[PDB]
Enzyme design. Structure first.
Site, PDB file in Angstrom:
ATOM      1  N   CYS A 130       3.018  -4.520   6.676  1.00  0.00           N
ATOM      2  CA  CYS A 130       2.749  -4.235   5.277  1.00  0.00           C
ATOM      3  C   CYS A 130       3.901  -3.442   4.690  1.00  0.00           C
ATOM      4  O   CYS A 130       4.628  -2.760   5.419  1.00  0.00           O
ATOM      5  CB  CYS A 130       1.478  -3.408   5.126  1.00  0.00           C
ATOM      6  SG  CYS A 130       0.032  -4.130   5.950  1.00  0.00           S
TER       7      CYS A 130
ATOM      8  N   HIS B 251       0.820  -1.191   0.000  1.00  0.00           N
ATOM      9  CA  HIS B 251       0.000   0.000   0.000  1.00  0.00           C
ATOM     10  C   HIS B 251       0.861   1.250   0.000  1.00  0.00           C
ATOM     11  O   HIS B 251       2.087   1.159   0.042  1.00  0.00           O
ATOM     12  CB  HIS B 251      -0.954  -0.047   1.184  1.00  0.00           C
ATOM     13  CG  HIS B 251      -0.291   0.103   2.503  1.00  0.00           C
ATOM     14  ND1 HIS B 251       0.594   1.108   2.799  1.00  0.00           N
ATOM     15  CD2 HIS B 251      -0.472  -0.585   3.652  1.00  0.00           C
ATOM     16  CE1 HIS B 251       0.958   1.004   4.078  1.00  0.00           C
ATOM     17  NE2 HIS B 251       0.328  -0.030   4.614  1.00  0.00           N
TER      18      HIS B 251
END
Lengths: 177, 194
Positions: free
Chosen positions: B108, B100
């Site tokens: 992440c 992301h």
């Protein structure tokens, strides 16, 4: 934040006002995402028929967004439609083209992503309403044009401003619900 | 010019080098489209295993419509789809592991916003036009024997030795590795005698 990517989506073009409104399904009615400045169209007012240098008025997409070689991020309007068929027209970014509607590159980026978004998640077609102008009777009376009858589109413009739903459209003449 | 949108696509991440290479099918083999700095991941080196692990995953993953927005938290999240077949076979737990843009996250890989824009469009592109999965190879580091030696004596030698064949297959063939889990172990296929 546009965490609304991939929800269904709908477009309205206004040729005279040189703008494209882009809306998104939020529950059961479409609400304005953003709206974008049309740098270039051609042939001014009126739809396409022949070497004609006009930009079309009246369309679904699906996967006619394969790029062409000439243009950046072209969305093929899919002219000629069922009506046109009485006659490579595109929405794309800053480029010089014959008919197509020319946005800023920033603008096409934003648009193209939301469309492909909607496409990826269901959304059989994305419909696109192309008008010569905002269709308030004010403008409408601003008549006597060879295009006046093609009054076939007002119902479309009207439907949407009232219900905020893309019109269900279909003898040589457009009709809505 | 990116008239190559909607062509198939493949991603390789390199934690140690802090970069993501994005490739696109040009005929019979993928060619580097562009490659992008990873601003932030967490837990540094090795795969993800428990909930508390501040670890970002390593392994071979697929993307489909794991672009549903949980943008509630992140910008343009692509869910890697952890746990995969391997991960489940070792009974690891996680969810919501993402590639992301510039947001603050636990497991992440965080790109710049410019970077994710470019990636996400090319992905959705590919899926629109066929392309059942995008394969996503996440490595601890470029898996040259040079680096593999710097990192002997790691708890994960064995694990990483399972990835090298994949990294290897790709630098060799420039085709996504045909990988599959056998008995808790990735095995990278490779043709027979014909």
């Amino acid at each position: 934040k546009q965490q609304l990517m991939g929800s269904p989506v709908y477009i309205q073009i206004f040729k005279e006002e040189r703008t494209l409104d882009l809306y998104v399904k939020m529950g059961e009615q479409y609400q304005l995402l953003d709206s974008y400045k049309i740098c270039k169209y051609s042939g001014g007012l009126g739809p396409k028929q022949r070497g004609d240098f006009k930009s079309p008025e009246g369309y679904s997409v699906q996967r006619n967004q394969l790029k062409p070689s000439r243009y950046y991020k072209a969305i093929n309007i899919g002219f000629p439609n069922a009506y046109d068929r009485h006659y490579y027209l595109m929405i794309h970014g800053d480029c010089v083209s014959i008919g197509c509607y020319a946005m800023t590159n920033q603008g096409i980026d934003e648009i193209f992503q939301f469309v492909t978004g909607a496409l990826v998640f269901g959304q059989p077609s994305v419909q696109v309403s192309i008008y010569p102008f905002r269709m308030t009777d004010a403008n409408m009376k601003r008549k006597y044009s060879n295009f006046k009858d093609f009054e076939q589109l007002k119902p479309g413009y009207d439907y949407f401003e009232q219900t905020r739903k893309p019109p269900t459209v279909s003898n040589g003449r457009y009709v809505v619900s």
